[PDB]
Amino acid sequence: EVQLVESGGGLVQPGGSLRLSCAASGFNVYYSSIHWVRQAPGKGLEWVASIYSSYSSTSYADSVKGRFTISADTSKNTAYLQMNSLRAEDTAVYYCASGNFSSWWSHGWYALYWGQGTLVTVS
Amino acid sequence: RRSVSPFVLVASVAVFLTATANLTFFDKISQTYPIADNLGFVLTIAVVLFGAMLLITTLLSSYRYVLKPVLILLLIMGAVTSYFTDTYGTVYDTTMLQNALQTDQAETKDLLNAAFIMRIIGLGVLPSLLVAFVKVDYPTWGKGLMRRLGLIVASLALILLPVVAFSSHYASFFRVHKPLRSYVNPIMPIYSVGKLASIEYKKASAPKDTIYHAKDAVQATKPDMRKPRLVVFVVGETARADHVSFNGYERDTFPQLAKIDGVTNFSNVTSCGTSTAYSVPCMFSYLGADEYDVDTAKYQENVLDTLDRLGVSILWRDNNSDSKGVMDKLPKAQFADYKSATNNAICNTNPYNECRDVGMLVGLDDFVAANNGKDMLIMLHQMGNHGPAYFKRYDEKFAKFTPVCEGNELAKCEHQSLINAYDNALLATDDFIAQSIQWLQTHSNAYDVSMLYVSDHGESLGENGVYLHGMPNAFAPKEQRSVPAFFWTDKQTGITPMATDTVLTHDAITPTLLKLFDVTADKVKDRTAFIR
Amino acid sequence: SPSSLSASVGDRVTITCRASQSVSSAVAWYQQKPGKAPKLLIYSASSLYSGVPSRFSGSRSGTDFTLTISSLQPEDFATYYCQQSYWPITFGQGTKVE
Ligand SMILES: CCCCCCCCCCCCCC(=O)O[C@H](CCCCCCCCCCC)CC(=O)O[C@@H]1[C@@H](NC(=O)C[C@@H](CCCCCCCCCCC)OC(=O)CCCCCCCCCCC)[C@H](OC[C@H]2O[C@H](OP(=O)(O)O)[C@H](NC(=O)C[C@H](O)CCCCCCCCCCC)[C@@H](OC(=O)C[C@H](O)CCCCCCCCCCC)[C@@H]2O)O[C@H](CO[C@]2(C(=O)O)C[C@@H](O[C@]3(C(=O)O)C[C@@H](O)[C@@H](O)[C@@H]([C@H](O)CO)O3)[C@@H](O)[C@@H]([C@H](O)CO)O2)[C@H]1OP(=O)(O)O
Ligand SMILES: CCCCCCCC/C=C\CCCCCCCC(=O)OC[C@H](COP(=O)(O)OCCN)OC(=O)CCCCCCC/C=C\CCCCCCCC
Numbered sequence: 001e002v003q004l005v006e007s008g009g010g011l012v013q014p015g016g017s018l019r020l021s022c023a024a025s026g027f028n029v030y031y032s033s034i035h036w037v038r039q040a041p042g043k044g045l046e047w048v049a050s051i052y053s054s055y056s057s058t059s060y061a062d063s064v065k066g067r068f069t070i071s072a073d074t075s076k077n078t079a080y081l082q083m084n085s086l087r088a089e090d091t092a093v094y095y096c097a098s099g100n101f102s103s104w105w106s107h108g109w110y111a112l113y114w115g116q117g118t119l120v121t122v123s
Numbered sequence: 124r125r126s127v128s129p130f131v132l133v134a135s136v137a138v139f140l141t142a143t144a145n146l147t148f149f150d151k152i153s154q155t156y157p158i159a160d161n162l163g164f165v166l167t168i169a170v171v172l173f174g175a176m177l178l179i180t181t182l183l184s185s186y187r188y189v190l191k192p193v194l195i196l197l198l199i200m201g202a203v204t205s206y207f208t209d210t211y212g213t214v215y216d217t218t219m220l221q222n223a224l225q226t227d228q229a230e231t232k233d234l235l236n237a238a239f240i241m242r243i244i245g246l247g248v249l250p251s252l253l254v255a256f257v258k259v260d261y262p263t264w265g266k267g268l269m270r271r272l273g274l275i276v277a278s279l280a281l282i283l284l285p286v287v288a289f290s291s292h293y294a295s296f297f298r299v300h301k302p303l304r305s306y307v308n309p310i311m312p313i314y315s316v317g318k319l320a321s322i323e324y325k326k327a328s329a330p331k332d333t334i335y336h337a338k339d340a341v342q343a344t345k346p347d348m349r350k351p352r353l354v355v356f357v358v359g360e361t362a363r364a365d366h367v368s369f370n371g372y373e374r375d376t377f378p379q380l381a382k383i384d385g386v387t388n389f390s391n392v393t394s395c396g397t398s399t400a401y402s403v404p405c406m407f408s409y410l411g412a413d414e415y416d417v418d419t420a421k422y423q424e425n426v427l428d429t430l431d432r433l434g435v436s437i438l439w440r441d442n443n444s445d446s447k448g449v450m451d452k453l454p455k456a457q458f459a460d461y462k463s464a465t466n467n468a469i470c471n472t473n474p475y476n477e478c479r480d481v482g483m484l485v486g487l488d489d490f491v492a493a494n495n496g497k498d499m500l501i502m503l504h505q506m507g508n509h510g511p512a513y514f515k516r517y518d519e520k521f522a523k524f525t526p527v528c529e530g531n532e533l534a535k536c537e538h539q540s541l542i543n544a545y546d547n548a549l550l551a552t553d554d555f556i557a558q559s560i561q562w563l564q565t566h567s568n569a570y571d572v573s574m575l576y577v578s579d580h581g582e583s584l585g586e587n588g589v590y591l592h593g594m595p596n597a598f599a600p601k602e603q604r605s606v607p608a609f610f611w612t613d614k615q616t617g618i619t620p621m622a623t624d625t626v627l628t629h630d631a632i633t634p635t636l637l638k639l640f641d642v643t644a645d646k647v648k649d650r651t652a653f654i655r
Numbered sequence: 656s657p658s659s660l661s662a663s664v665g666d667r668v669t670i671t672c673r674a675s676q677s678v679s680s681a682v683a684w685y686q687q688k689p690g691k692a693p694k695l696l697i698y699s700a701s702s703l704y705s706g707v708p709s710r711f712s713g714s715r716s717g718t719d720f721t722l723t724i725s726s727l728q729p730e731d732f733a734t735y736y737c738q739q740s741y742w743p744i745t746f747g748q749g750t751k752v753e
Binding site: 035037042043044045046047050059060061095099106107108109110111112113114115116117 | 656657680681683685687692693695698699702704734736738741742743744745746747748749
């Protein structure tokens, strides 16, 4: 089954860098979908980026644009989000969520399964 | 063997093409959307694909006396495109067909192999003989036209009704999953042919003037009060930025550059495109990768024209194919191809009877003597790691990684056996670069030598099924755009390169070449360059 | 920032999200438990995902999409987020029940 798990949290300093991982287990192969959604402590969910590894098509949410860059290792079935020049607001719990399956006359393409989340604290 | 109507033959041809010629697209659809959870969508996709094929076949086979030749052409074209879209995982766009029409027979011969011949004979020649050897009767024009519209309306219904019934699904498919529309054959080849014909018509109707961009470019100092400069810009064929030792690689594919002091390698260089014909003009054009248009590349002013006009004599020593439209405004006496033994003195050192790159350094001293006192830009083109024959781009002296893939098909050799041959060809390129650096060093007492190397595109070697360059610039894999870059210069010329971790693209070539000869042009001055 | 809009419990609830882009086929809701990862309940703004016996039904009204829970909620009490559009993705302000 799907077992998307996250790694690469820990403490970082402002202006530093980090690099996370996702997409464990086979699930729906790996390519296509799989996103990145973060949550500040005591705040609503905010979308960060959306890799579409296969076509090299990505997107960013303005407030996280120009510093974030997503890689993709299909051989190892793992997605990476490279973070540079972090500030104080960047502290949050980060999830990754795929999207697939439409049944019949129902569509889909939603951030459906997630992971336990890795805390990314800046200080 | 009774006479069969033309329309049933057209339907059978459409069914055969949608069944056998769309294997890669069907696999991609069934692997992106699982058949166990998207039955309706995949069924409608198959139905609309068959409808599109039927519509295409009915529209180009409207006439009666051309039905059979058009069917033969469609079958052969579909088979020949499908083999390459299956084994090598390549698509067909305008750039891909432009590359296909700019080839030489030597390159085409490597692609030819027994498996490809057998597959066409089985898929586009045997059905060709089946279609050509049956009897077909053409009814009166009235009933024939009636049945033709009936087929037209049936295909249009099979195209539109699944779209309407699955409006949201197909809207998402056409908005997000555009690249799969390029994997369908032979519809995509026909669309590419039409687009290419339109582009060629626009090019022919275009004027034959030069759109200037560096009219204000002036040389800071002439080669009379200073030491004349000499740059050997080695245009590189296929190479991957992650396959060099400096940017991280388990094997040592560049040992001869580690012992050469002054070599700086930038870890992040993204090329203009995934094909040589699309990348070489983009290296030398004053327009960046976001503005450059291949259709007008030769008409626009390039940095070479500016350098020649300013008084810097230039030389091109071709090895791979052709200057690709960049060495056209300059006299033919400067562009000297080295593909054949008539010019390349170092050949026949291998059973394959190929002419290597090191032979392009035999005779440069004559040009240096003929240009004693003025700046020179001796640009060298490489055969590089040109496929699908990586094992033919090196001599046995560099046969260091065993085993190698001696076969002509990439799908049969194991990944390691292909990696070994690719890295051996990279070693040959390394040796060529080192010899060029030594030749530059032997002239240090009279010139301020400099060397710059950059590959035009990367390569795919099995990742996600792709096996060769040529993918469209919009959605090509990163492995087809990551290229190595090396810059070496003498420690006395006072040229300070950028940091090794700087992020640069193919747009940095023209500013670097202009900065080497101290030329400032406002069109390109505000761009990142390999050197300060 | 979170918001405790309904804060009623023991009856049907209705929480609205304003979709700047219509994209009725790309609207979904998520049930984020206080410490765990969010669930997916209700997708496409009209369909149901496995894991609930039609308790959360969901519906649409013009440009505004609302969530409806019919039965009582002895287990729930989590936060719900509206999700507008898929490329890119924007989430709502969240809701809470008590
Ligand atoms: C013979 C009869 C044929 C009947 C045809 C029936 C179809 C009727 C069409 C109705 C149109 C309604 C429009 C609408 O109602 O809306 C639509 C509604 C969607 C519903 C679809 C309609 C329902 C139809 C259902 C029935 C059929 C399935 C929304 C939309 O479709 O999406 C909109 C798109 N609209 C279309 O594509 C019309 C398009 C419709 C698309 C759907 C077609 C589906 C295939 C039909 C097959 C039918 C069977 C034959 O019509 C076409 O012509 C296609 C014609 C295909 C027929 C050819 C047949 C081949 C054989 C020929 C034999 C005779 C459009 O995308 C732009 C281009 O995309 C491709 O270019 P490419 O070539 O790929 O590069 C298209 N290439 C094609 O289609 C060709 C096709 O694929 C290949 C062939 C496929 C063959 C079929 C295969 C069969 C298998 C099917 C399997 C199911 C090209 O189309 C064109 O013009 C082409 C034009 O004819 C040229 C013609 C030249 C003449 C040569 C002809 C040769 C003839 C010779 C013959 C011998 C189009 O111009 O604009 C935006 C997105 O673009 C932006 C944006 O604005 O956001 C802009 C841009 O971003 C930039 C910027 O530049 O601004 C770029 C940078 O600068 C950067 O900086 C960024 C940014 O800033 C980042 O920094 O910005 C861009 O890069 C993009 C990126 O993604 C963002 O990253 O984003 C979208 O808006 P939005 O999504 O709504 O928001
Ligand atoms: C007689 C046997 C064939 C029977 C069928 C008859 C119809 C086709 C006849 C000729 C087809 C032979 C293929 C020749 C293509 C050669 C070009 C090529 O693949 O290399 C281009 C290029 C090399 O990079 P550059 O350095 O830019 O190369 C420029 C100088 N070579 O390679 C690629 O892009 C990768 C190619 C992958 C395989 C695809 C082969 C070419 C495409 C299919 C054949 C041509 C189109 C066929 C019909 C299409 C619709 C009209």
